[PDB]
Amino acid sequence: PNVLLQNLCCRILGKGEADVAQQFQYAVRVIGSNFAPTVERDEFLVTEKIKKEFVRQRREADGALFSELHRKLQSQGVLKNRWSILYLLLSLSEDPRKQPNKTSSFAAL
Amino acid sequence: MSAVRETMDVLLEISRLLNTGLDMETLSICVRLCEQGINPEALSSVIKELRRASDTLKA
Amino acid sequence: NMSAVRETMDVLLEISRLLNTGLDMETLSICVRLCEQGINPEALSSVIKELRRASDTLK
Amino acid sequence: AVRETMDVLLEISRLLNTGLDMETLSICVRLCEQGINPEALSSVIKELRRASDTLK
Amino acid sequence: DIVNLQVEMIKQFHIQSSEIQMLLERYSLNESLVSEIEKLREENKRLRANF
Amino acid sequence: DIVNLQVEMIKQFHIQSSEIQMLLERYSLNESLVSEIEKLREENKRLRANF
Amino acid sequence: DKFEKETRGSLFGALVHSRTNDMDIKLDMPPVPENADLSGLAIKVPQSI
């Protein structure tokens, strides 16, 4: 798990193989804290929130598509951690809308 | 190896549609950590700080 | 160019006054320059309120 | 008084499929009678159960 | 949600205070370092016997 | 918002430790001085290996 | 020449400290050690030469 999270840090930054030590140290801290997620396990409940999110960015065709993909996903492998992956993706979603500001001058402040 | 690869490929289909915006390699790590027990909320949070940190750095 | 920026300022300035502000024209100019340069709108709003409050305690 | 109450509380926990020990509930009566906020009492114990999980 | 804020805040203070003290106990002097200063004074006296 | 709140709590404590950690290294002890006690020791042994 | 040089460094055995061919050495014992203030003076045995 030490290796996996360190490799996680190195990969995202696209470089730094022992220079991402500081970011790593933080990540070890956040993970070491605890959470109580609103909605805990149960596959139906997470699928329902994902569909609402799809409709909201106006990607209807995608909402219908995903549902087949969910049944398929299950069939390919069955976990007790299935829900944690689907909720993880959910939170980590990105909106298409707006520019995500500058980073080419926002760095400096 | 056969079983594992086939969930990931189905998993990468969802990720590109839902607009995760993560890479393939990184996702496999996210999934291994879950199966070993991680909280989802913490895991997204870490991803987010790392992501923002990379963009600023490049420019 | 000089004319165009003035009009851009001018319209914003009219809106700030309707909504009631304590900022002058000079400060308002600075804010816009920050807006263009990135900077989510909530961080800017907060730093202003704390700085406005501290000035009253001092004077 | 503490014991009599612990048995009825023990019945309730078993229904919820929530594991607590005999001992925890009895200590709980002691804390209540001294005064404890309902949020606090729950929070110390919730964490203490998770600590026990990680530890072994 | 408020429960989360209540549990977590206390945890962060406890962890953070652990680290700082552990930093302070190590930096203030290890016994090992002190012993070389004692040795150096004994060495200085024998040197003053060669002059 | 609650999740944004958590990113800020934990990250601030992490910053605090880094700042404290360096400040504490410098003024609680001099690494420079201690290296110099060990050096003088070594110079004096070498002096005595030349008689 | 070996015998003469060896004697001379110790000044006919009138030195125990350092070898010198100077005749300008001050003959003095050292100040009490720091390991000799924690337990009092102790005579060094010349073991393992």
Question: DSSP secondary structure string, F15-50?
Answer: HHHHHHHHHHHHHH--HHHHHHHHHHHHHHHHHTT-
Please provide the size of chain G in residues: 49
Q: Which residue has the tokens 């298409």?
A: A96
Cα gap D27→D41, rounded to integer Å: 11
Breaks (C-N over 2.5 A) in chain E follow: none
Which of A91, A54, A92, A94 has the alpha carbon at shortest distance from A70? A54
Q: What is the three-class DSSP state of A55?
A: helix
Would you list which residues of chain F are within 8 Å, Cβ to Cβ, of chain B?
A: 3, 6-7, 11
Using the 8-state DSSP alphabet, how is residue A42 labeled? Answer: -
Which of F11, E35, F48, C1 has the alpha carbon at shortest distance from B45? F11
Cα gap C25→C32, rounded to integer Å: 11
Q: What is the three-class DSSP state of A23?
A: helix
The alpha-helical segments, DSSP class H, found in E1-51 are 2-27, 31-47
Q: What is the three-class DSSP state of A95?
A: coil
Rg (CA), chain G: 14
- CB atoms under 10 Å from CB of B42, counted, come to 22
Angle at alpha carbon of residue G30, lines to G28 and G35, rounded to 5°: 165
Please say whether the beta carbons of D21 and D13 come within 8 A: no
* Facing residue for A29 by CB, picked from F3, F10, F18: F10
Structure tokens at A71: 């049944």
In this complex, the chains that touch B, judged by 3 or more CB pairs closer than 8 A, are: A, F
Contact call for B3 and A77, based on CB within 8 A: yes
Please name the residues in contact with F36: beta carbons below 8 A apart, sequence gap of 6 or more. Answer: none
Please say whether the beta carbons of E20 and F20 come within 8 A: yes
> What is the experimental method?
cryo-EM
Structure tokens at A23: 């970011």
Cα gap C12→D33, rounded to integer Å: 62
